[PDB]
Structures are given as C-alpha cells and as structure tokens.
PDB file of N, CA and C and ligand atoms in Angstrom:
ATOM      1  N   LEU A   1      -1.776   9.867 -16.652  1.00 48.66           N
ATOM      2  CA  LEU A   1      -3.173   9.993 -16.245  1.00 48.66           C
ATOM      3  C   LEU A   1      -3.665  11.405 -16.546  1.00 48.66           C
ATOM      4  N   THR A   2      -4.489  11.536 -17.579  1.00 48.48           N
ATOM      5  CA  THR A   2      -5.022  12.820 -18.009  1.00 48.48           C
ATOM      6  C   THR A   2      -6.384  13.090 -17.372  1.00 48.48           C
ATOM      7  N   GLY A   3      -6.723  14.371 -17.276  1.00 48.37           N
ATOM      8  CA  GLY A   3      -8.026  14.766 -16.776  1.00 48.37           C
ATOM      9  C   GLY A   3      -8.142  16.273 -16.718  1.00 48.37           C
ATOM     10  N   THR A   4      -9.292  16.727 -16.218  1.00 52.58           N
ATOM     11  CA  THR A   4      -9.562  18.148 -16.019  1.00 52.58           C
ATOM     12  C   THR A   4     -10.259  18.362 -14.683  1.00 52.58           C
ATOM     13  N   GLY A   5      -9.613  19.081 -13.773  1.00 50.43           N
ATOM     14  CA  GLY A   5     -10.242  19.396 -12.503  1.00 50.43           C
ATOM     15  C   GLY A   5      -9.434  20.405 -11.722  1.00 50.43           C
ATOM     16  N   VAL A   6     -10.107  21.037 -10.756  1.00 50.25           N
ATOM     17  CA  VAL A   6      -9.438  21.973  -9.857  1.00 50.25           C
ATOM     18  C   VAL A   6      -8.511  21.207  -8.925  1.00 50.25           C
ATOM     19  N   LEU A   7      -7.248  21.620  -8.875  1.00 48.04           N
ATOM     20  CA  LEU A   7      -6.257  21.001  -8.003  1.00 48.04           C
ATOM     21  C   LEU A   7      -6.109  21.802  -6.715  1.00 48.04           C
ATOM     22  N   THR A   8      -6.329  21.145  -5.579  1.00 50.41           N
ATOM     23  CA  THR A   8      -6.194  21.762  -4.267  1.00 50.41           C
ATOM     24  C   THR A   8      -5.258  20.907  -3.422  1.00 50.41           C
ATOM     25  N   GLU A   9      -4.646  21.526  -2.415  1.00 53.46           N
ATOM     26  CA  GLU A   9      -3.795  20.790  -1.485  1.00 53.46           C
ATOM     27  C   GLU A   9      -4.629  19.863  -0.610  1.00 53.46           C
ATOM     28  N   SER A  10      -4.135  18.645  -0.406  1.00 55.38           N
ATOM     29  CA  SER A  10      -4.940  17.589   0.185  1.00 55.38           C
ATOM     30  C   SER A  10      -4.466  17.234   1.585  1.00 55.38           C
ATOM     31  N   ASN A  11      -5.432  16.851   2.421  1.00 59.08           N
ATOM     32  CA  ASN A  11      -5.185  16.357   3.766  1.00 59.08           C
ATOM     33  C   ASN A  11      -5.052  14.843   3.833  1.00 59.08           C
ATOM     34  N   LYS A  12      -5.301  14.136   2.733  1.00 58.73           N
ATOM     35  CA  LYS A  12      -5.152  12.689   2.729  1.00 58.73           C
ATOM     36  C   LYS A  12      -3.682  12.308   2.779  1.00 58.73           C
ATOM     37  N   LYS A  13      -3.381  11.245   3.514  1.00 56.33           N
ATOM     38  CA  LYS A  13      -2.014  10.765   3.658  1.00 56.33           C
ATOM     39  C   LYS A  13      -1.924   9.417   2.963  1.00 56.33           C
ATOM     40  N   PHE A  14      -1.276   9.396   1.804  1.00 57.95           N
ATOM     41  CA  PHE A  14      -1.167   8.165   1.039  1.00 57.95           C
ATOM     42  C   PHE A  14      -0.091   7.277   1.630  1.00 57.95           C
ATOM     43  N   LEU A  15      -0.344   5.983   1.583  1.00 58.65           N
ATOM     44  CA  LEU A  15       0.686   5.014   1.865  1.00 58.65           C
ATOM     45  C   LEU A  15       1.678   4.991   0.695  1.00 58.65           C
ATOM     46  N   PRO A  16       2.943   4.625   0.946  1.00 58.51           N
ATOM     47  CA  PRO A  16       3.980   4.741  -0.107  1.00 58.51           C
ATOM     48  C   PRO A  16       3.773   3.859  -1.337  1.00 58.51           C
ATOM     49  N   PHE A  17       2.924   2.837  -1.260  1.00 57.73           N
ATOM     50  CA  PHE A  17       2.606   2.067  -2.452  1.00 57.73           C
ATOM     51  C   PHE A  17       1.463   2.672  -3.254  1.00 57.73           C
ATOM     52  N   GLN A  18       0.877   3.770  -2.789  1.00 55.68           N
ATOM     53  CA  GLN A  18      -0.268   4.376  -3.454  1.00 55.68           C
ATOM     54  C   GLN A  18       0.149   5.602  -4.253  1.00 55.68           C
ATOM     55  N   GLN A  19      -0.380   5.711  -5.464  1.00 56.90           N
ATOM     56  CA  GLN A  19      -0.107   6.849  -6.332  1.00 56.90           C
ATOM     57  C   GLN A  19      -1.319   7.740  -6.527  1.00 56.90           C
ATOM     58  N   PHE A  20      -2.500   7.151  -6.696  1.00 55.83           N
ATOM     59  CA  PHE A  20      -3.724   7.893  -6.955  1.00 55.83           C
ATOM     60  C   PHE A  20      -4.837   7.384  -6.044  1.00 55.83           C
ATOM     61  N   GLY A  21      -5.922   8.138  -6.016  1.00 52.31           N
ATOM     62  CA  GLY A  21      -7.111   7.749  -5.270  1.00 52.31           C
ATOM     63  C   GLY A  21      -8.344   7.846  -6.139  1.00 52.31           C
ATOM     64  N   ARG A  22      -9.257   6.893  -5.964  1.00 53.01           N
ATOM     65  CA  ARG A  22     -10.479   6.860  -6.754  1.00 53.01           C
ATOM     66  C   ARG A  22     -11.701   7.136  -5.882  1.00 53.01           C
ATOM     67  N   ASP A  23     -12.705   7.756  -6.503  1.00 58.54           N
ATOM     68  CA  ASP A  23     -13.992   8.058  -5.889  1.00 58.54           C
ATOM     69  C   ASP A  23     -14.977   6.923  -6.181  1.00 58.54           C
ATOM     70  N   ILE A  24     -16.273   7.195  -5.999  1.00 59.56           N
ATOM     71  CA  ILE A  24     -17.323   6.221  -6.288  1.00 59.56           C
ATOM     72  C   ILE A  24     -17.322   5.831  -7.765  1.00 59.56           C
ATOM     73  N   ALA A  25     -17.172   6.806  -8.661  1.00 60.75           N
ATOM     74  CA  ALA A  25     -17.226   6.542 -10.096  1.00 60.75           C
ATOM     75  C   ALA A  25     -15.882   6.141 -10.693  1.00 60.75           C
ATOM     76  N   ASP A  26     -14.888   5.824  -9.849  1.00 60.86           N
ATOM     77  CA  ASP A  26     -13.529   5.437 -10.258  1.00 60.86           C
ATOM     78  C   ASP A  26     -12.863   6.499 -11.135  1.00 60.86           C
ATOM     79  N   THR A  27     -13.102   7.764 -10.806  1.00 60.76           N
ATOM     80  CA  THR A  27     -12.344   8.877 -11.354  1.00 60.76           C
ATOM     81  C   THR A  27     -11.320   9.332 -10.323  1.00 60.76           C
ATOM     82  N   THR A  28     -10.166   9.774 -10.808  1.00 58.27           N
ATOM     83  CA  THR A  28      -9.079  10.148  -9.913  1.00 58.27           C
ATOM     84  C   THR A  28      -9.408  11.460  -9.211  1.00 58.27           C
ATOM     85  N   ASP A  29      -9.771  11.364  -7.931  1.00 61.09           N
ATOM     86  CA  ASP A  29     -10.072  12.532  -7.118  1.00 61.09           C
ATOM     87  C   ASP A  29      -8.897  12.974  -6.253  1.00 61.09           C
ATOM     88  N   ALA A  30      -7.858  12.149  -6.141  1.00 60.76           N
ATOM     89  CA  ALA A  30      -6.638  12.519  -5.442  1.00 60.76           C
ATOM     90  C   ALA A  30      -5.458  11.885  -6.161  1.00 60.76           C
ATOM     91  N   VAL A  31      -4.347  12.617  -6.245  1.00 63.59           N
ATOM     92  CA  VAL A  31      -3.183  12.165  -6.996  1.00 63.59           C
ATOM     93  C   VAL A  31      -1.917  12.607  -6.267  1.00 63.59           C
ATOM     94  N   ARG A  32      -0.871  11.792  -6.377  1.00 63.25           N
ATOM     95  CA  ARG A  32       0.446  12.125  -5.849  1.00 63.25           C
ATOM     96  C   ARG A  32       1.308  12.680  -6.975  1.00 63.25           C
ATOM     97  N   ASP A  33       1.911  13.836  -6.739  1.00 62.48           N
ATOM     98  CA  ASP A  33       2.803  14.432  -7.726  1.00 62.48           C
ATOM     99  C   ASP A  33       4.102  13.635  -7.792  1.00 62.48           C
ATOM    100  N   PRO A  34       4.539  13.206  -8.981  1.00 64.19           N
ATOM    101  CA  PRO A  34       5.675  12.277  -9.067  1.00 64.19           C
ATOM    102  C   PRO A  34       7.031  12.916  -8.825  1.00 64.19           C
ATOM    103  N   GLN A  35       7.116  14.245  -8.761  1.00 63.34           N
ATOM    104  CA  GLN A  35       8.382  14.932  -8.526  1.00 63.34           C
ATOM    105  C   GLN A  35       8.530  15.342  -7.066  1.00 63.34           C
ATOM    106  N   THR A  36       7.571  16.093  -6.539  1.00 66.96           N
ATOM    107  CA  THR A  36       7.496  16.379  -5.111  1.00 66.96           C
ATOM    108  C   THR A  36       6.344  15.552  -4.564  1.00 66.96           C
ATOM    109  N   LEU A  37       6.661  14.593  -3.696  1.00 65.16           N
ATOM    110  CA  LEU A  37       5.692  13.584  -3.268  1.00 65.16           C
ATOM    111  C   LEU A  37       4.683  14.210  -2.307  1.00 65.16           C
ATOM    112  N   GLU A  38       3.698  14.894  -2.886  1.00 64.90           N
ATOM    113  CA  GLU A  38       2.605  15.481  -2.128  1.00 64.90           C
ATOM    114  C   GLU A  38       1.278  15.096  -2.769  1.00 64.90           C
ATOM    115  N   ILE A  39       0.232  15.096  -1.949  1.00 66.55           N
ATOM    116  CA  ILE A  39      -1.103  14.668  -2.359  1.00 66.55           C
ATOM    117  C   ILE A  39      -1.951  15.892  -2.673  1.00 66.55           C
ATOM    118  N   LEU A  40      -2.736  15.807  -3.748  1.00 71.45           N
ATOM    119  CA  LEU A  40      -3.597  16.893  -4.201  1.00 71.45           C
ATOM    120  C   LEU A  40      -5.001  16.352  -4.434  1.00 71.45           C
ATOM    121  N   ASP A  41      -6.017  16.995  -3.851  1.00 73.75           N
ATOM    122  CA  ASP A  41      -7.391  16.694  -4.245  1.00 73.75           C
ATOM    123  C   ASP A  41      -7.729  17.293  -5.603  1.00 73.75           C
ATOM    124  N   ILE A  42      -8.550  16.569  -6.366  1.00 74.02           N
ATOM    125  CA  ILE A  42      -8.968  17.067  -7.669  1.00 74.02           C
ATOM    126  C   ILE A  42     -10.481  17.241  -7.719  1.00 74.02           C
ATOM    127  N   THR A  43     -10.983  18.358  -7.197  1.00 71.87           N
ATOM    128  CA  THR A  43     -12.405  18.645  -7.316  1.00 71.87           C
ATOM    129  C   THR A  43     -12.708  19.015  -8.767  1.00 71.87           C
ATOM    130  N   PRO A  44     -13.827  18.560  -9.329  1.00 72.98           N
ATOM    131  CA  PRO A  44     -14.098  18.859 -10.738  1.00 72.98           C
ATOM    132  C   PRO A  44     -14.477  20.318 -10.946  1.00 72.98           C
ATOM    133  N   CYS A  45     -14.215  20.792 -12.166  1.00 73.45           N
ATOM    134  CA  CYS A  45     -14.601  22.139 -12.572  1.00 73.45           C
ATOM    135  C   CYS A  45     -16.121  22.275 -12.552  1.00 73.45           C
ATOM    136  N   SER A  46     -16.600  23.505 -12.355  1.00 76.00           N
ATOM    137  CA  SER A  46     -18.021  23.727 -12.105  1.00 76.00           C
ATOM    138  C   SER A  46     -18.877  23.412 -13.329  1.00 76.00           C
ATOM    139  N   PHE A  47     -20.020  22.774 -13.089  1.00 74.01           N
ATOM    140  CA  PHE A  47     -20.957  22.390 -14.131  1.00 74.01           C
ATOM    141  C   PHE A  47     -22.275  23.105 -13.886  1.00 74.01           C
ATOM    142  N   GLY A  48     -22.882  23.638 -14.941  1.00 71.13           N
ATOM    143  CA  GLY A  48     -24.117  24.373 -14.781  1.00 71.13           C
ATOM    144  C   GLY A  48     -25.083  24.100 -15.915  1.00 71.13           C
ATOM    145  N   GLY A  49     -26.347  24.420 -15.652  1.00 71.63           N
ATOM    146  CA  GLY A  49     -27.387  24.342 -16.654  1.00 71.63           C
ATOM    147  C   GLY A  49     -27.813  25.723 -17.093  1.00 71.63           C
ATOM    148  N   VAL A  50     -27.698  26.018 -18.382  1.00 68.38           N
ATOM    149  CA  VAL A  50     -27.996  27.347 -18.903  1.00 68.38           C
ATOM    150  C   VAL A  50     -29.470  27.391 -19.279  1.00 68.38           C
TER     151      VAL A  50
ATOM    152  N   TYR B   1       4.362 -13.091 -10.690  1.00 67.54           N
ATOM    153  CA  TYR B   1       4.550 -11.895  -9.880  1.00 67.54           C
ATOM    154  C   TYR B   1       4.459 -12.296  -8.414  1.00 67.54           C
ATOM    155  N   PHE B   2       5.478 -11.952  -7.627  1.00 67.59           N
ATOM    156  CA  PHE B   2       5.552 -12.385  -6.234  1.00 67.59           C
ATOM    157  C   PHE B   2       5.279 -11.158  -5.364  1.00 67.59           C
ATOM    158  N   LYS B   3       4.102 -11.132  -4.741  1.00 63.75           N
ATOM    159  CA  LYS B   3       3.612  -9.998  -3.960  1.00 63.75           C
ATOM    160  C   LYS B   3       3.920 -10.206  -2.480  1.00 63.75           C
ATOM    161  N   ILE B   4       4.596  -9.234  -1.866  1.00 60.60           N
ATOM    162  CA  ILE B   4       4.846  -9.239  -0.425  1.00 60.60           C
ATOM    163  C   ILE B   4       3.997  -8.156   0.225  1.00 60.60           C
ATOM    164  N   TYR B   5       3.038  -8.574   1.044  1.00 62.81           N
ATOM    165  CA  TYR B   5       2.267  -7.675   1.889  1.00 62.81           C
ATOM    166  C   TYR B   5       2.738  -7.818   3.331  1.00 62.81           C
ATOM    167  N   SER B   6       2.911  -6.696   4.031  1.00 66.74           N
ATOM    168  CA  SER B   6       3.520  -6.754   5.354  1.00 66.74           C
ATOM    169  C   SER B   6       2.833  -5.804   6.327  1.00 66.74           C
ATOM    170  N   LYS B   7       2.883  -6.166   7.608  1.00 64.30           N
ATOM    171  CA  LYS B   7       2.391  -5.343   8.707  1.00 64.30           C
ATOM    172  C   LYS B   7       3.131  -5.716   9.985  1.00 64.30           C
ATOM    173  N   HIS B   8       3.546  -4.714  10.753  1.00 63.29           N
ATOM    174  CA  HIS B   8       4.173  -4.937  12.049  1.00 63.29           C
ATOM    175  C   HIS B   8       3.243  -4.430  13.143  1.00 63.29           C
ATOM    176  N   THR B   9       3.006  -5.265  14.156  1.00 66.03           N
ATOM    177  CA  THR B   9       2.066  -4.942  15.219  1.00 66.03           C
ATOM    178  C   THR B   9       2.716  -5.192  16.575  1.00 66.03           C
ATOM    179  N   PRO B  10       2.711  -4.212  17.479  1.00 65.30           N
ATOM    180  CA  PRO B  10       3.172  -4.452  18.857  1.00 65.30           C
ATOM    181  C   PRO B  10       2.151  -5.253  19.655  1.00 65.30           C
ATOM    182  N   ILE B  11       2.540  -6.461  20.069  1.00 62.51           N
ATOM    183  CA  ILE B  11       1.670  -7.343  20.837  1.00 62.51           C
ATOM    184  C   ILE B  11       2.359  -7.712  22.145  1.00 62.51           C
ATOM    185  N   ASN B  12       1.557  -8.229  23.085  1.00 65.17           N
ATOM    186  CA  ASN B  12       2.087  -8.665  24.371  1.00 65.17           C
ATOM    187  C   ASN B  12       1.456  -9.966  24.862  1.00 65.17           C
ATOM    188  N   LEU B  13       0.916 -10.791  23.969  1.00 64.80           N
ATOM    189  CA  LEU B  13       0.268 -12.032  24.368  1.00 64.80           C
ATOM    190  C   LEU B  13       1.286 -13.170  24.339  1.00 64.80           C
ATOM    191  N   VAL B  14       1.108 -14.128  25.249  1.00 65.84           N
ATOM    192  CA  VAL B  14       2.164 -15.094  25.542  1.00 65.84           C
ATOM    193  C   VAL B  14       2.196 -16.219  24.512  1.00 65.84           C
ATOM    194  N   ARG B  15       1.062 -16.876  24.269  1.00 68.94           N
ATOM    195  CA  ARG B  15       1.062 -18.182  23.616  1.00 68.94           C
ATOM    196  C   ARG B  15       0.416 -18.168  22.236  1.00 68.94           C
ATOM    197  N   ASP B  16      -0.844 -17.765  22.133  1.00 68.90           N
ATOM    198  CA  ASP B  16      -1.634 -17.963  20.931  1.00 68.90           C
ATOM    199  C   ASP B  16      -1.639 -16.678  20.101  1.00 68.90           C
ATOM    200  N   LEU B  17      -2.422 -16.671  19.025  1.00 68.86           N
ATOM    201  CA  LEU B  17      -2.585 -15.458  18.239  1.00 68.86           C
ATOM    202  C   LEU B  17      -3.416 -14.431  19.004  1.00 68.86           C
ATOM    203  N   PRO B  18      -3.060 -13.150  18.924  1.00 72.22           N
ATOM    204  CA  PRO B  18      -3.917 -12.111  19.501  1.00 72.22           C
ATOM    205  C   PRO B  18      -5.187 -11.948  18.687  1.00 72.22           C
ATOM    206  N   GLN B  19      -6.235 -11.481  19.354  1.00 72.95           N
ATOM    207  CA  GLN B  19      -7.514 -11.229  18.707  1.00 72.95           C
ATOM    208  C   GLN B  19      -7.654  -9.736  18.431  1.00 72.95           C
ATOM    209  N   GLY B  20      -7.734  -9.381  17.154  1.00 68.46           N
ATOM    210  CA  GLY B  20      -7.807  -7.987  16.766  1.00 68.46           C
ATOM    211  C   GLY B  20      -7.787  -7.854  15.260  1.00 68.46           C
ATOM    212  N   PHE B  21      -7.653  -6.612  14.794  1.00 68.62           N
ATOM    213  CA  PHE B  21      -7.669  -6.326  13.366  1.00 68.62           C
ATOM    214  C   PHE B  21      -6.439  -5.521  12.959  1.00 68.62           C
ATOM    215  N   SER B  22      -5.757  -5.955  11.893  1.00 67.17           N
ATOM    216  CA  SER B  22      -4.601  -5.218  11.374  1.00 67.17           C
ATOM    217  C   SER B  22      -4.412  -5.550   9.895  1.00 67.17           C
ATOM    218  N   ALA B  23      -4.620  -4.567   9.017  1.00 66.96           N
ATOM    219  CA  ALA B  23      -4.483  -4.777   7.577  1.00 66.96           C
ATOM    220  C   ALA B  23      -3.020  -4.736   7.144  1.00 66.96           C
ATOM    221  N   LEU B  24      -2.645  -5.661   6.259  1.00 67.48           N
ATOM    222  CA  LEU B  24      -1.263  -5.803   5.807  1.00 67.48           C
ATOM    223  C   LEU B  24      -1.013  -4.944   4.569  1.00 67.48           C
ATOM    224  N   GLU B  25      -0.073  -3.994   4.671  1.00 66.57           N
ATOM    225  CA  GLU B  25       0.288  -3.172   3.520  1.00 66.57           C
ATOM    226  C   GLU B  25       1.247  -3.907   2.579  1.00 66.57           C
ATOM    227  N   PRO B  26       1.106  -3.722   1.262  1.00 63.84           N
ATOM    228  CA  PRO B  26       2.060  -4.326   0.314  1.00 63.84           C
ATOM    229  C   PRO B  26       3.440  -3.688   0.410  1.00 63.84           C
ATOM    230  N   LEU B  27       4.465  -4.530   0.537  1.00 65.79           N
ATOM    231  CA  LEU B  27       5.834  -4.055   0.698  1.00 65.79           C
ATOM    232  C   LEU B  27       6.655  -4.130  -0.589  1.00 65.79           C
ATOM    233  N   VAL B  28       6.814  -5.330  -1.152  1.00 61.82           N
ATOM    234  CA  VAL B  28       7.697  -5.586  -2.292  1.00 61.82           C
ATOM    235  C   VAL B  28       6.951  -6.407  -3.338  1.00 61.82           C
ATOM    236  N   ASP B  29       6.941  -5.918  -4.579  1.00 65.15           N
ATOM    237  CA  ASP B  29       6.462  -6.673  -5.733  1.00 65.15           C
ATOM    238  C   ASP B  29       7.686  -7.187  -6.486  1.00 65.15           C
ATOM    239  N   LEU B  30       7.864  -8.508  -6.493  1.00 67.15           N
ATOM    240  CA  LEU B  30       9.144  -9.138  -6.787  1.00 67.15           C
ATOM    241  C   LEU B  30       9.053  -9.911  -8.094  1.00 67.15           C
ATOM    242  N   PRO B  31       9.889  -9.581  -9.087  1.00 70.76           N
ATOM    243  CA  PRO B  31       9.871 -10.229 -10.420  1.00 70.76           C
ATOM    244  C   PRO B  31      10.692 -11.509 -10.587  1.00 70.76           C
ATOM    245  N   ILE B  32      10.110 -12.634 -10.194  1.00 71.72           N
ATOM    246  CA  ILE B  32      10.800 -13.914 -10.252  1.00 71.72           C
ATOM    247  C   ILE B  32      10.423 -14.712 -11.504  1.00 71.72           C
ATOM    248  N   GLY B  33       9.132 -14.860 -11.794  1.00 64.86           N
ATOM    249  CA  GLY B  33       8.693 -15.632 -12.948  1.00 64.86           C
ATOM    250  C   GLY B  33       9.016 -17.110 -12.890  1.00 64.86           C
ATOM    251  N   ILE B  34       8.860 -17.739 -11.725  1.00 66.37           N
ATOM    252  CA  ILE B  34       9.139 -19.160 -11.578  1.00 66.37           C
ATOM    253  C   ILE B  34       7.945 -19.868 -10.957  1.00 66.37           C
ATOM    254  N   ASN B  35       7.951 -21.188 -11.103  1.00 64.26           N
ATOM    255  CA  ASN B  35       6.928 -22.050 -10.535  1.00 64.26           C
ATOM    256  C   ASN B  35       7.236 -22.292  -9.063  1.00 64.26           C
ATOM    257  N   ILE B  36       6.234 -22.093  -8.209  1.00 68.15           N
ATOM    258  CA  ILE B  36       6.356 -22.344  -6.778  1.00 68.15           C
ATOM    259  C   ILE B  36       5.196 -23.230  -6.356  1.00 68.15           C
ATOM    260  N   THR B  37       5.510 -24.399  -5.797  1.00 72.36           N
ATOM    261  CA  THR B  37       4.492 -25.275  -5.241  1.00 72.36           C
ATOM    262  C   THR B  37       4.782 -25.700  -3.812  1.00 72.36           C
ATOM    263  N   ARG B  38       5.979 -25.441  -3.289  1.00 76.45           N
ATOM    264  CA  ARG B  38       6.333 -25.890  -1.952  1.00 76.45           C
ATOM    265  C   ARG B  38       7.321 -24.892  -1.360  1.00 76.45           C
ATOM    266  N   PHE B  39       7.216 -24.637  -0.056  1.00 75.69           N
ATOM    267  CA  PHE B  39       8.029 -23.602   0.573  1.00 75.69           C
ATOM    268  C   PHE B  39       8.551 -24.124   1.905  1.00 75.69           C
ATOM    269  N   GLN B  40       9.548 -23.426   2.451  1.00 74.94           N
ATOM    270  CA  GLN B  40      10.103 -23.783   3.754  1.00 74.94           C
ATOM    271  C   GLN B  40      10.750 -22.548   4.369  1.00 74.94           C
ATOM    272  N   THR B  41      10.395 -22.250   5.617  1.00 77.41           N
ATOM    273  CA  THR B  41      10.915 -21.093   6.333  1.00 77.41           C
ATOM    274  C   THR B  41      12.231 -21.429   7.035  1.00 77.41           C
ATOM    275  N   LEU B  42      13.002 -20.385   7.332  1.00 72.42           N
ATOM    276  CA  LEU B  42      14.333 -20.520   7.914  1.00 72.42           C
ATOM    277  C   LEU B  42      14.362 -20.020   9.352  1.00 72.42           C
ATOM    278  N   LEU B  43      14.853 -20.869  10.253  1.00 75.70           N
ATOM    279  CA  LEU B  43      15.036 -20.570  11.668  1.00 75.70           C
ATOM    280  C   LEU B  43      16.526 -20.403  11.968  1.00 75.70           C
ATOM    281  N   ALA B  44      16.830 -20.051  13.218  1.00 74.61           N
ATOM    282  CA  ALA B  44      18.203 -19.836  13.659  1.00 74.61           C
ATOM    283  C   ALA B  44      18.463 -20.626  14.934  1.00 74.61           C
ATOM    284  N   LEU B  45      19.585 -21.343  14.967  1.00 78.15           N
ATOM    285  CA  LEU B  45      19.992 -22.081  16.152  1.00 78.15           C
ATOM    286  C   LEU B  45      20.713 -21.180  17.153  1.00 78.15           C
ATOM    287  N   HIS B  46      20.737 -21.636  18.404  1.00 80.33           N
ATOM    288  CA  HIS B  46      21.545 -21.045  19.462  1.00 80.33           C
ATOM    289  C   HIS B  46      22.531 -22.088  19.966  1.00 80.33           C
ATOM    290  N   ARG B  47      23.812 -21.736  19.983  1.00 81.88           N
ATOM    291  CA  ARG B  47      24.870 -22.649  20.388  1.00 81.88           C
ATOM    292  C   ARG B  47      25.488 -22.163  21.691  1.00 81.88           C
ATOM    293  N   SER B  48      25.800 -23.101  22.580  1.00 81.03           N
ATOM    294  CA  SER B  48      26.393 -22.760  23.868  1.00 81.03           C
ATOM    295  C   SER B  48      27.445 -23.782  24.284  1.00 81.03           C
TER     296      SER B  48
HETATM  297  C1  LIG C   1      13.198  14.057  -8.387  1.00 81.53           C
HETATM  298  O1  LIG C   1      12.193  13.052  -8.163  1.00 81.53           O
HETATM  299  C2  LIG C   1      12.357  12.321  -6.938  1.00 81.53           C
HETATM  300  C3  LIG C   1      11.270  11.272  -6.910  1.00 81.53           C
HETATM  301  O2  LIG C   1      10.673  11.115  -8.191  1.00 81.53           O
HETATM  302  C4  LIG C   1      12.297  13.275  -5.745  1.00 81.53           C
HETATM  303  O3  LIG C   1      12.564  12.549  -4.552  1.00 81.53           O
HETATM  304  C5  LIG C   1      13.310  14.404  -5.908  1.00 81.53           C
HETATM  305  O4  LIG C   1      13.143  15.361  -4.869  1.00 81.53           O
HETATM  306  C6  LIG C   1      13.146  15.093  -7.262  1.00 81.53           C
HETATM  307  N1  LIG C   1      14.164  16.114  -7.442  1.00 81.53           N
HETATM  308  C7  LIG C   1      13.899  17.423  -7.403  1.00 81.53           C
HETATM  309  C8  LIG C   1      15.069  18.337  -7.610  1.00 81.53           C
HETATM  310  O5  LIG C   1      12.765  17.851  -7.210  1.00 81.53           O
END
C-alpha cells in the first residue's frame, strides 16, 4: 500500500483482523506496521494555493 | 471461503435470548473449497 502523508502515532486501537483504516474518500488514514504491530495516523502533507 | 465471525458476551438471562446489541468480530477465514448445503451441530452427553 503506497502513499504520501505525515505519519503520526495513533490513539486508534485496531482489532486483530484489521490492517488499515479508511476515511470518507477511502484513502488510508490509519495503518498498522507489519513488523511492530502499532497503529499510525496518516495526515496528508500540506496543500496550498500560490 | 468459510468465514467465522465470533463474539463472546457475559449474560445472565434464564430462558430466552437477551435483548441488546453486540457486533460479531471475524475470527477465522477457513480455506475449504467445498459445497455445503446442510449442517448439524454437536452436543455432549452426561453419563451417570
Ligand atoms: C517480526 O514480525 C512479527 C510479526 O510480523 C513480530 O511479531 C516480531 O516482533 C517481528 N520481529 C522483530 C525482531 O521485530
């Protein structure tokens, strides 16, 4: 699962059958690391209008 | 694909089903690949 976003430590507690979490637009906003089983929020990188 | 969803709930009602809400989490996804049209559960006898 590829993407680009800021990774932060998450307060969500995934059930053991869950690997990722989806938002309204079905983009992965939370993911479980497959080596150390911890949850990370993925806030997107900042977007601006020049 | 044989999907097992499971939930354990502490209840204290005597006879009928309790009234409440409890979502069943998926436990085991089981690779059988066979036709199933009829089933039967297994009980245990008590001998004395
Ligand atoms: C290797 O991965 C498993 C689960 O994928 C994990 O439980 C284990 O801690 C990992 N080993 C190390 C040394 O991180």
